[model samples]
Target: MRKKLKAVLFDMDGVLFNSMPYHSEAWHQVMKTHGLDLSREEAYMHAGRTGASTINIVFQRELGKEATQEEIESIYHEKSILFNSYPEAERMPGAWELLQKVKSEGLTPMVVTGSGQLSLLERLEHNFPGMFHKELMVTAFDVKYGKPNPEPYLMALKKGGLKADEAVVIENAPLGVEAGHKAGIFTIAVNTGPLDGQVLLDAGADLLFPSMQTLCDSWDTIM
Candidate 1:
């Protein structure tokens, strides 16, 4: 069904930036160093989870126990240091064009991410300058739960002052797609990573695109 859109909730890691490799690598290395068996591919599947959640998951899977708060904090600190050592991630192809189109078309854009890094907001400001407002973002700090749950997206809708039907979710991860659908919105998935399209389809995406560029190219029809 064609729907009028007032705002959009976008995922950050793979949708806004092409930094999945670095993210998954951080998870991969951390898991390896700690004698866990998380592959890079599995790490990508865990995208949209907070860093603490990710560490706990790996620990539970490999060690049969959840990580303690102190352990989680220390492990994620190491991961953060590793991620920060890498160069700043760049916007995906067509990201800038899509943002401009969304704005010109009078649709508000909001970020809904599971990341809790201090640099996330700063990166957004640097990358898009003044395009986004702090209030419109729903980060890990704003929610008690992460993706695959509807709270983050629901919070985003509340923040944007719109209902689920009034906004669209742009995501690249299966968990993110499921989160969007669970929140009762039209969820569009962009296959910007190594995962197969079926993964997103099974996760409940209403629409799919091969890349952000493809999504941007068809913005008129989509809008």
Candidate 2:
């Protein structure tokens, strides 16, 4: 199906960097402070949502209404501060090597993330250098609907000018996996967090790897 592979779309948080721990921690702490009971595990499940979207889910479920713009801004601002307070996240193990292999194989690499966080977005160029291009990427700001809706990955496919079968998606969250699958791409889930691997499979992952390193090691076989 991927014989004409032209791009590799990646989800940022857990897939590109081992950053979900910090994000989940910040989300749990700040949401708790705001009177929302978002557990760390739940945060992982919500990993591919935009911050405002995540806040609105909890608010609607717990408070019977979506958060007002002011509340969304306040809560997300606090969460961002908390996330930044943690140590910086390192690149996922084998991510660089995988990217190198992708480039060497003549495939374009694109990011399709639900993050609107400028901090990590700005670090991409510095972290991986020429591996990504802005126009070929999709972020939270790029879609009206986020993961679990398929809009994000759909937009990435449009941005990269590639057909669904011409790209492979690398994701670490269920929502991200679902997005890619719904967008009609072959999605590979790398379980980089505490979620059971079955969770990803249930979400429609076409393939699964225990870690990014394992995926990198088996890239040739899969391709």
Candidate 3:
């Protein structure tokens, strides 16, 4: 179905930044240092959740409860430094172009990410200085609940000056896709996060892009 979506909300890490490798490596190092078994897929799975959620899952939540508030910040920052150690793997494919395209077209583009703290936002500003000039960011820090909850999606809507139905949320995780759909927005997914096209479809994404590099005609079809 063709939908008149007014705004496009982006998920930063996997969707726009392609920083999953750094995320995996960073977590792996931290997990290794702490002598816990960690996997790349696990890091990606925890991407859309909060820092506490990521820490709990990575450290075996079934075996123990979450880290303390201080531990969460300290450990999160520790991994963050490693994630950006090498800038060679920072930029996402088609990210700069897509942002430029959207901005030039007079569409509102904002970021809605699970990375709530200043670490990830700093990366966004460093990588894409003028990309999100209007500065539409809805982070886990701002919302009472994280992904898989409608609250984060609602927060994005509130920031982007959009209604649930009037917004189009582009995410790469099943949890985020579900949140957007549950919040009554048109959700589009890409195979960059923990989920693929099938998982995204199961979560109610309106469209799926393996990559947008060759999708020149897609813009006209989005509406």
Candidate 4:
């Protein structure tokens, strides 16, 4: 049965802004400098994971141990510096339109991202004024377990006082899609990055769109 839809949970990086390129570049460069060999493409695959989690994944795989707290902090600090050195990212095409549509339809729009980038979080209000509330957001700081785990999405639902069936998740990364699907929400994947759409589907997205614009155009049908 179709459930009552009340809120739309959005993933922030590739889905809201064209910031993935900067992120991928920063991660790839920093990891290589630290003796890890994360490719730019693989960085996208790790999107929606907390910085600590991503670092730990590589460390455990190659070094056979989790990163120590000092290592995690140091690597993330370097990555952040490199990411911020890039020019500010622009809003994703159609993201504003999609948020507008969600608003016009009387649905609450919330952010559920694995980013802990304060600069980008601050920019959200400037870029999409009145679209999100701090209380309605779930960032890396909000969860012990990040995407690919259901904790973040589950936390968002609890914050909104919503049931999983009453909300939809719009994500641009495989890990984010997996989180939403594991939470039992109807997850939509917008293929805004370089990954093939099949990756999102395999991660359990219920619907896939090529861009935010296409998703916005078909919002009513989805509803």
Per-residue lDDT tens digits of candidate 3, residues 78-101?
A: 776776575645567777777777
Clashing pairs in 4: none
Give lDDT for model 4: 0.92
Return model 3's CA RMSD, one decimal: 2.6
lDDT of 2 at 175: 87
Per-candidate TM equals 0.96, 0.97, 0.85, 0.97
Q: Write the per-residue lDDT of candidate 2 for residues 7-51, one digit (tens) a residue.
A: 999999998888999999999999999888888988877888999
Better of 1 and 4 by lDDT: 4
Best by lDDT: 4
Model 4, position 147: C-alpha lDDT score: 91
Q: Where in model 1 is the C-alpha error above 4 Å?
A: 1-3
Instruction: Give residue 175's error in model 1 in angstroms.
Output: 0.4
In order, what lDDT does every prediction score?
0.88, 0.91, 0.73, 0.92
Candidate 4 lDDT over 92-162, as tens digits, reads 99999999988987889999998989999999999998999999999999999799999999999999999
Worst 10 residues of 1 by lDDT: 1-10
> What would the per-residue lDDT of candidate 1 be over residues 1-223, giving only the tens digit for each residue?
3456799788988888888998999888877886788899889989888888888888888899989999888888988887777887789988888999888878898999999777755789788766788899999889887898998999999998888889999999999999999999999999999978998989999889999999999988864
Candidate 2 lDDT (Cα, 0 to 1)? 0.91
- Whichever of 1 and 2 has more lDDT, that candidate is 2
How does model 4 score by TM-score?
Answer: 0.97
